[PDB]
Structure formats: structure tokens, C-alpha cells
């Protein structure tokens, strides 16, 4: 849900 | 005229390599890395900053802790929050927990952030040379990245637009004697000192924005  | 190579680690702007472990919080390590360099530029003092503080407290700004997030949203939280605690006072445990931000333990502030033009590697070179380490997103979704060890990383299946991992550009350089040949970005990862080259990776530079390094770069304004 975005960068991880 | 920009220098032929830059390495902010040799000037005291960068903390030792950290490890996010089993939590999708690289966005938080990238953000603390950039704020660490800007606070060092501002005060001459290097102080490790709390990734956990960002994981636990920046959901209102649109981050989702161990489930992912964005460095720009993290710098927005620090601005709105009025501060950020140190690594020491708000330790990293790699799981989503209750926000325990304590203003008396804040060691950093920012007023917002600056963005580098999307996809412009020479704008990023200029930012790295004149400001300090820069937060960036990249496509790290490959076994070749997972098992990277040394040399200039180049992956054919890399994407310059669909990115999945936050990192920190601490400099740039080249191999050999020609400063314009086989160039690379010096990048700090958050998978521990044991991964890659003492926790770092050299990513191909000026090769059509390889892995999206200059697609979403930014730094906090201190
Ligand atoms: Cl971001």
C-alpha cells in the first residue's frame, strides 16, 4: 500500500 | 559545476545501516535517513531518528505503518506534528504499535519538503551534490536485488515507474578514470549491514532512470  | 563524485558518509551525515526486519517500513527508514542528514547539516550533530515514531503515528498523514507508506507523508507528519523523537528514546520493534510520541524527546523538525522533478536524473544529481542525502523510491522487486553483493546494479526487468521500496541516495560516482563512464548512485538500504555491500548498493546512473531512482525523490526542509 505504498513503499515497503 | 557539480562534483564528479559525492559521498555524504565521508562527511558525517549518515548513521550506520539499520534493519527494518519483517515490516514494510522502508519508507520510514528512508525518511529518517534524509532528516538525519539535514539535521546534521543544520546543527553539526548526528542523531539517529525514530522510524517507529513514524510507523506508529503517521496514519493520519496517509501512511500505514508496517503495511507501507511514503517518505513525503512522513515529512508531512513531522511538520504537522512539530517534531520527531530519537531512535534511542522511541526504539524500533518492527510491528505496528500505539503512538507514543513525546515532545520532550523530539530531536528533529521540518517545515515541509522539497521534491526533485520526476524522472530527472540530473536534477537529482544536483540535489545530492548541494543538499545532502535524498529520499528516493525504487523498484527493488527482484531476486537480483535481494541477492545483490557488489558492482553496479543493473536489472533488465526493472521498472522506472512502478516502485515498491524506499531508500536513501547518499552520493554518486563512477568506476574507472573517466568520470562519465559506468556511473552509479550510492544507495543506503535498510536490510541491515549484512545485505549487499555493507548495507549499500551501487545503482546504474544516467541509464534512463534505472529502477526509477529519480522518479519520486524528495528531502525535508529544516
Ligand atoms: Cl514519497
* 3-class DSSP string for chain B: CCCCCEEHHHHCCCCCCCECCCCECHHHHHHHHHHHHHHHHHHCCCCCECHHHHHHHCCCCCCCCCECECHHHHHHHHHHHCCEEECCCCCCCCCCCCCCCCHHHEEECCCCEEECCCCCHHHHHHHHHHCCCEEEEECCCCHHHHCCCCCEECCCCCCCCCCCEEEEEEEEEECCCCCCCCEEEEEECCECCCCCECCEEEEECCCCCHHHCCCCCEEECC
- The SS3 of residue A3 is strand
Is A3 in contact with B64 (Cβ distance < 8 A)? no
Contact B215, B160 (CB under 8 A): yes
Q: How was this structure determined?
A: X-ray
C-alpha B20 – ligand 1 centre gap (Å): 17
Show residues of chain B in contact with A2, CB under 8 Å: 27, 63-64, 68-70
B73 CA distance to ligand 1 middle (Å): 7
Nearest to B29 by CA among B47, B12, B9, B48: B48
Q: How far is CA B140 from CA A3, B111, B216, in A?
A: 10, 30, 14
Alpha carbons B199 and B211: distance in angstroms, whole number: 18
Chain B residues whose CB is inside 8 A of the A1 CB are 64, 67-69
Nearest Cα residue to B135 out of B2, B5, B8, B1 = B8
Residue B201: strand pairing partners: B187
Chain B: closest CA distance from residue A1 (Å): 5
Nearest CA in chain A to B163: A3
Cα–Cα distance, B196 to B201 (Å, whole number): 6
The minimum CA-CA distance between A3 and chain B, rounded to whole Å, is 5
CB B174 within 8 A of CB B4: yes
**DSSP class of residue A1?**
-
With contact defined as beta carbons under 8 Å apart, do B190 and B206 qualify?
Answer: no
* Ligand 1 mean position, distance from CA B72 (Å): 4
Instruction: Go through the domains of chain B in sequence order and give each one's CATH number.
Output: 6-220 (3.90.70.10)
> Quick check: B138 and B212 in contact, CB under 8 A?
yes
Q: Quick one: how far is CA B1 from the chain centroid?
A: 25
Nearest chain B Cα distance for residue A4, angstroms: 4
User: Alpha-carbon distance B142 to B155, whole Å?
Assistant: 8
Spacing of C-alpha B11 from chain mean position: 17
Nearest CA in chain B to A1: B68
Give the count of alpha carbons within 13 A of B174, CB side only: 14
Is residue B167 a contact partner of residue B218, using CB atoms and an 8 Å limit?
no
Question: Which residues are CB-neighbours of B181 under 8 A, at least 6 positions away?
Answer: B174, B175
Nearest to B203 by CA among B172, B178, B157: B172
Q: What residues of chain A lie within 8 A of the CB of B163, using their CB?
A: 3
Block residue for cell numbers 528531502 = B219
| One-letter-per-residue 3-state SS of B89-146 | CCCCCCCCCCCCCCHHHEEECCCCEEECCCCCHHHHHHHHHHCCCEEEEECCCCHHHH
Amino acid at each position: 500500500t505504498a513503499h515497503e | 559545476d557539480l562534483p564528479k563524485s559525492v559521498d555524504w558518509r565521508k562527511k558525517g551525515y549518515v548513521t550506520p545501516v539499520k534493519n527494518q526486519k519483517q515490516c514494510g517500513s522502508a519508507w520510514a527508514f528512508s525518511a529518517t535517513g534524509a532528516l538525519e542528514g539535514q539535521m546534521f547539516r543544520k546543527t553539526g550533530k548526528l542523531v539517529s531518528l525514530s522510524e517507529q515514531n513514524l510507523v506508529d503515528c503517521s496514519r493520519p498523514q496517509g501512511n500505514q505503518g508496517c503495511n507501507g507508506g511514503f517518505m513525503a507523508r512522513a515529512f508531512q507528519y513531522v511538520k504537522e506534528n512539530g517534531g520527531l523523537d530519537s531512535e534511542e528514546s522511541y526504539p524500533y520493534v518492527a510491528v505496528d504499535e500505539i503512538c507514543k510520541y513525546r515532545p520532550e524527546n523530539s530531536v528533529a523538525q521540518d517545515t515541509g519538503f522539497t521534491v526533485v522533478a520526476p524522472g530527472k536524473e540530473k536534477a537529482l544529481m544536483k540535489a545530492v551534490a548541494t543538499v545532502g542525502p535524498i529520499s528516493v523510491a525504487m523498484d527493488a522487486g527482484h531476486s537480483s536485488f535481494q541477492f545483490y553483493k557488489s558492482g553496479i546494479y543493473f536489472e533488465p526487468d526493472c521498472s522506472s515507474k512502478n516502485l515498491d521500496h524506499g531508500v536513501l541516495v547518499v552520493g554518486y560516482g563512477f568506476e574507472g578514470a573517466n568520470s562519465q563512464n559506468s556511473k552509479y548512485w550510492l544507495v543506503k538500504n535498510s536490510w541491515g549491514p549484512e545485505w549487499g555491500s555493507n548495507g549499500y548498493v551501487k545503482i546504474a546512473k544516467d541509464k534512463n532512470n534505472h529502477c526509477g531512482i529519480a522518479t519520486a525523490a524528495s528531502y525535508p526542509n529544516v
